[PDB]
A paper describes a structure:
Xylanases (E.C. 3.2.1.8) are hemicellulases responsible for breaking down xylan, the major hemicellulosic component of plant cell walls, into short xylooligosaccharides by a general acid–base mechanism involving two glutamic acid residues. Typically, these enzymes can be classified into glycoside hydrolase (GH) families 10 and 11 based on amino-acid sequence similarities. Recently, these enzymes have received much attention owing to their use in degradation of lignocellulosic biomass for biofuels production.
The present study reports the development of a novel endoxylanase family GH10 derived from sugarcane soil metagenome (SCXyl). To the best of our knowledge, this is the first report of a three-dimensional structure for a GH10 derived from a metagenomic library. Collectively, our findings bring relevant insights on enzymatic mechanisms for production of added-value products from plant biomass.
Residue numbers in the entry: 32 to 280, 292 to 379
Write the structure that this text describes.
């Protein structure tokens, strides 16, 4: 019982996000060992996305992704495949023909299916969960006007899952999305999910990205999302969990980056209290959740350091800039003691 994964077995798997640099650099070895000690599930940050894996939709770059999957099997990880079909980080050449004007519905369908057949096929039986479709719902309670939707309709989701289930029938198919605590967006998602599953579409689970803030959203809305998803027939997945502790709502300002010198004790405790309250709800509905994954291991590798404002110093994860366990981490351990 050494890592946080051992404390949370019999409940749900504790995962993290693995960067490409961690796999292709020998000086990032301590990070790899740190992940193997603490987590029992992994998710590729970028190496399995369309553009980084297949730039201009031409030649594949399996190298980075292969080292990821191999690392997972080397430690018996719950390997998650990140993004088969996403609206972002996808080459423009995909949504256009050989002219190239706007591609047709049938031709684009072939591109999506060929991509799935190749990507999911290469790691068939070696990947436990796939992020089939991601962020298909607009935050205003409607369909996202992506090229995927505007051309193939909304049924591109139904086809992506169907194709993936044919390619790798043992993989747990997942629909991922953010802002799932927003009722108007959550209702649209659950409704969409229920409609597809009724039509035979193999949707096994729905992923909550859980890009939460230090203040909100509340644990009540988080709980309601868990209940709504459970009643939808799918399994709950926490996919990209992180806690933004910086003032939000861009241009850099000395006042909106007030923790350059470090994170104060009252902030460390407010963050510890935050993570604790969230996991309290997770443990309450442990039978609904299959996996809880934090988007990164240490604070130095978070995307929130440079987004939405570049140059800031953020503390969203369980480990700090020096790979040391933060009070929030131990706070989560005490829950299972």
């Amino acid at each position: 019982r050494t890592g946080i994964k051992d404390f949370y077995k019999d409940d749900f798997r504790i995962g993290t996000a693995v960067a490409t640099a961690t796999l292709t650099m020998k000086e990032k070895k301590p990070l790899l060992a740190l992940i193997a000690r603490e987590f029992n599930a992994i998710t590729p940050e970028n190496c399995m996305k369309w553009e980084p894996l297949k730039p201009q939709d031409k030649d594949w770059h399996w190298e980075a992704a292969d080292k990821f999957v191999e690392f997972g099997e080397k430690h018996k990880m719950y390997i998650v495949g990140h993004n088969l079909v996403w609206h972002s980080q996808v080459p423009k050449e995909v949504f256009l023909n050989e002219s190239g004007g706007t591609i047709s519905k049938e031709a684009l369908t072939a591109k999506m299916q060929d991509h799935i057949a190749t990507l999911a096929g290469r790691y068939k039986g070696r990947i436990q969960a796939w992020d089939v479709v991601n962020e298909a719902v607009e935050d205003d309670g409607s369909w996202r006007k992506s090229p995927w939707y505007n051309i193939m309709g909304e049924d591109f989701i139904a086809k992506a899952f169907t194709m993936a289930h044919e390619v790798d029938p043992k993989a747990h198919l997942i629909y991922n999305d953010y802002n799932t605590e927003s009722p108007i967006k959550r209702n649209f998602i659950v409704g969409m999910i229920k409609n597809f599953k009724k039509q035979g579409v193999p949707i096994h689970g729905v992923g909550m990205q859980e890009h939460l803030a230090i203040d909100g959203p509340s644990v009540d809305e988080i709980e309601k999302t868990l209940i709504a998803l459970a009643d939808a027939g799918v399994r709950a997945h926490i996919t990209e969990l992180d806690i933004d502790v910086l003032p939000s709502v861009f241009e850099y300002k000395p006042e909106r980056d007030p923790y350059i010198q470090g994170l104060p004790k009252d902030m460390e405790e407010k963050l510890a209290k935050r993570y604790e309250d969230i996991f309290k709800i997770y443990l309450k509905h442990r039978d609904k959740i299959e996996r809880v994954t934090l988007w990164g291991t240490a604070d130095n590798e978070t995307w929130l350091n440079d987004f939405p404002i570049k140059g800031r110093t953020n503390y969203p994860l369980l480990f700090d800039r020096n790979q040391k366990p933060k009070p929030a981490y131990f706070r989560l351990l005490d829950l299972k003691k």
